[PDB]
RNA sequence: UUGAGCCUUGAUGUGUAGGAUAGGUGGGAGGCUUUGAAGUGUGGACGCCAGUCUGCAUGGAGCCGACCUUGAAAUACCACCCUUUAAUGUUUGAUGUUCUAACGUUGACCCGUAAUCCGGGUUGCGGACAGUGUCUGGUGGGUAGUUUGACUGGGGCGGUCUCCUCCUAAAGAGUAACGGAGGAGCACGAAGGUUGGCUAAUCCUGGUCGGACAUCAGGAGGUUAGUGCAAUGGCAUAAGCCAGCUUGACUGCGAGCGUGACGGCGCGAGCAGGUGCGAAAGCAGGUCAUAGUGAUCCGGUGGUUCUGAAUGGAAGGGCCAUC
RNA sequence: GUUUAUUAAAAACACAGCACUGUGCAAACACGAAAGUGGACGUAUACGGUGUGACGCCUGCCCGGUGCCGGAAGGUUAAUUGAUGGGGUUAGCGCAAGCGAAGCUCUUGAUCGAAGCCCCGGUAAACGGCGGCCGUAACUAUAACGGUCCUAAGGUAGCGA
RNA sequence: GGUUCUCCCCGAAAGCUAUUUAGGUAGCGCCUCGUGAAUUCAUCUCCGGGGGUAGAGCACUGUUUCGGCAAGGGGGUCAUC
RNA sequence: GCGGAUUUAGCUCAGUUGGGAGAGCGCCAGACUGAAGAUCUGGAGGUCCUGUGUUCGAUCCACAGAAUUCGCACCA
RNA sequence: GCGGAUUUAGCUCAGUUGGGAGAGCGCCAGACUGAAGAUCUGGAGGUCCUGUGUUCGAUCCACAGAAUUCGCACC
């Protein structure tokens, strides 16, 4: 395997100690790391793993929404990060600054099918630093599609040597290792290469733990 | 097992059932060439990869 | 002088655009600011030119960044990351090169000693040598050993018990011989099936691309045919056939038995489960079969609700795989 | 000659030179468990291998094979030395399934490595060794003269039972 | 190698498989002795067909020879072996 | 098959900036020669070992397989 | 008798998946020589022993037969 839960438990109990959680000013974060050996251009080790954290940490996710008018009155309630309507996409047709704002600081861009202008105005700003949009359901009763994306992260690499993704915050390393191994399962499920291990670490807003395994 | 143009053993385990057996195959001809549907659990003939994954 | 590690000390780069000398792998959008802390401005001295040095400012004004531009690609703020290898510290070894309280003194002077063993100190020698104790290597018939089938028209040869058919040998069975003919040291990625299919040659005569021949439509209707190495036998409502559909060749018991000397070798009414094969009647344990291995004892090995001299883990055993 | 009294009575041969050979010397041999006594009261012209076949000439040649050994340019791949990978045994981490570190230890054929020997060099006393078919002389046929065959190869330094 | 006094009936011990057999070996008898039992067992008269010991043919495949011609093949001659 | 290396012309092999794929001996032809050899020069010469992925572009980067090949497993 | 090689170019002989027939040598041509060999460059040289069968295809293999020929059987 890549790793197992206790060899990730033992190392998040290290990561959330002051040794590795060197504090700035807020309630801070932790991540699961995988760097590869023989990682090259072919395709069999390339990844995209959109993974809802099986036990969500203290700091939720940056979910943009684009509802159609009927479901809006509910989407208004799912606690979305930011919102734009099926309509007002027609006005964003040239506005670089708004686009680069949204691209750079949101994470998830949830879009109704009628909103297909969404395929045009965001790609060249978002795409280069690997975050993705997705077909929002048509229902009013929308809530677990929003809540999932409000607790998910992604295995970005398309050709480059590393993954490193958000997985926890300051308070409960044990559950956060069920988050950590879920990312590793996505990977060993998408890339049966196994011996392409350079290393497996876990990492805070700064310092990284050279994990026991 | 001992020879070259030989009737050899190969470890054929089940698609579900864990159970293994063997009797024959031969390196003399092309090899990409077997699985079956069979069952040493006997319940339902469905998937059986041979010693070989065809 | 040379092996293995470790940054105490180093250093292997110019192309354009970007007011500017851009390895990467990456997170996101902010980062420093106590005045002796930070840049930012502007001289001056060095040169293996890609290094730095030294002066003097102003300085809570804002400046570095997605934010505005450029490009192959950003740079503010942190994480992560040391090797090809040098200098020397700090762990530490080892061949040469030796000197020499090991040592050997079966070399001398001195000495107990009118003394062949022997006592012992100075010297003089070479030298970690000697010594033997295992492991690897063959070297030779320098102790010791065996006399290893039997078949024998007495021996030397040529042939067999094997496991195999036809002769030969006197029917339930057999009974060689350096005898007569010929033999197994194995066979499937199918030479695997359950339906369904039948009528083929040779030669006569036709006809693109011949010059014996190869799909052919008809003679006559002949039961004038075929056999992938070996063989003898199959025997035709074809198994030889061959195209569709596609690979049961079940896990478990069995009245009844066919029988033998411990293995063993053969199969089946009927009963279970549900097992796959089917319209229905209904069928059955795979290459055409004959030729193909272990006395068994020791081994090895993979799995486990089978155990394991008070236990509990557990050696070792049991079950049966696997040889 | 009186020699192996015992088959031969020598028709055995014990001579004796010598190229090479054992040892620069507590020298080779070691009988005896400890001798250091032969060799030595002695040096590789003392003493031992394996022999020698009066005497004096004479020992051609010929290295394919196999001896004899001796070496080091470089491969086969052992004590010796141990890259590693996999485990065991076990802290830490796990409501459990189970992950899983030092230390201790199991197990590598890591990488050197030539005794032999592929090899490289020399051996005349080291082991034995001299090939056949197709064509033949002013006569039979002698068998000088013949082209060659990757064949290791045809009676040669004599005197002729 | 060799039955150290006598007697009476069953009683060829003395052979199939063989045997890195050589008067040697595993069980075994046609044996006795002790349990046990049925028409169990044998020859006949009979039922019922497989055998191929004989025998006999010419059928096959192999052919006797003699007739009579079977686009078979020989001898002679014209001819270009 | 464990792992590495190797496979580009007839054979030995260059092939590491991914952009033109080749040298050497030998083969061939001319020159030379009297003929050849030798010298000299031009000319010849491929399953890039296999075949896809990645790439604008593949001998080249990745991988699955093979053969050539070095050491190597082994108490069924 | 069994087993085996062998009947493959003048000469010595190679050869076979099982589909071409080879080479040193010899002859001949091309020229160099008045000429010939060498050495040269091109052409050519076959009882593949026979029969039969397998087979795409037999020089080959298996089977049967001739005929040389080799060892052992023989005492």
UniProtKB/Swiss-Prot annotation, chain A:
Keywords: Repressor, Ribonucleoprotein, Ribosomal protein, RNA-binding, rRNA-binding, Translation regulation, tRNA-binding
Listed GO biological process terms: regulation of translation; translation
Organism superkingdom: Archaea
GO cellular component term, pick one: large ribosomal subunit
Alphabetical list of CDD domains matching this protein: Ribosomal_L1 (cd00403)
Keyword Repressor in annotation: yes
InterPro entries hit by this protein: Ribosomal_uL1, Ribosomal_uL1-like, Ribosomal_uL1/biogenesis, Ribosomal_uL1_3-a/b-sand, Ribosomal_uL1_arc, Ribosomal_uL1_CS
Annotated GO MF terms: rRNA binding; structural constituent of ribosome; tRNA binding
Family matches, as Pfam families: Ribosomal_L1
Job of this protein: Probably involved in E site tRNA release. Binds directly to 23S rRNA.
NCBIfam families associated with the record: PRK04203.1
Entry similarity comment: Belongs to the universal ribosomal protein uL1 family.
Assembly behavior: Part of the 50S ribosomal subunit.
Record protein name field: Large ribosomal subunit protein uL1
Species name: Sulfolobus acidocaldarius (strain ATCC 33909 / DSM 639 / JCM 8929 / NBRC 15157 / NCIMB 11770)
Curated annotation (Swiss-Prot), chain B:
Modified-residue entries (N-methylalanine), positions: 1
Single GO MF annotation: structural constituent of ribosome
Protein source organism: Escherichia coli (strain K12)
Gene3D superfamilies referenced in this protein's UniProt entry, alphabetically: Ribosomal protein L33
Source organism phylogeny: Bacteria, Pseudomonadati, Pseudomonadota, Gammaproteobacteria, Enterobacterales
Keywords assigned: Methylation, Ribonucleoprotein, Ribosomal protein, RNA-binding, tRNA-binding
First and last residue of the signal peptide: none
Protein name according to UniProt: Large ribosomal subunit protein bL33
The organism's place on the tree of life at top rank: Bacteria
Family note: Belongs to the bacterial ribosomal protein bL33 family.
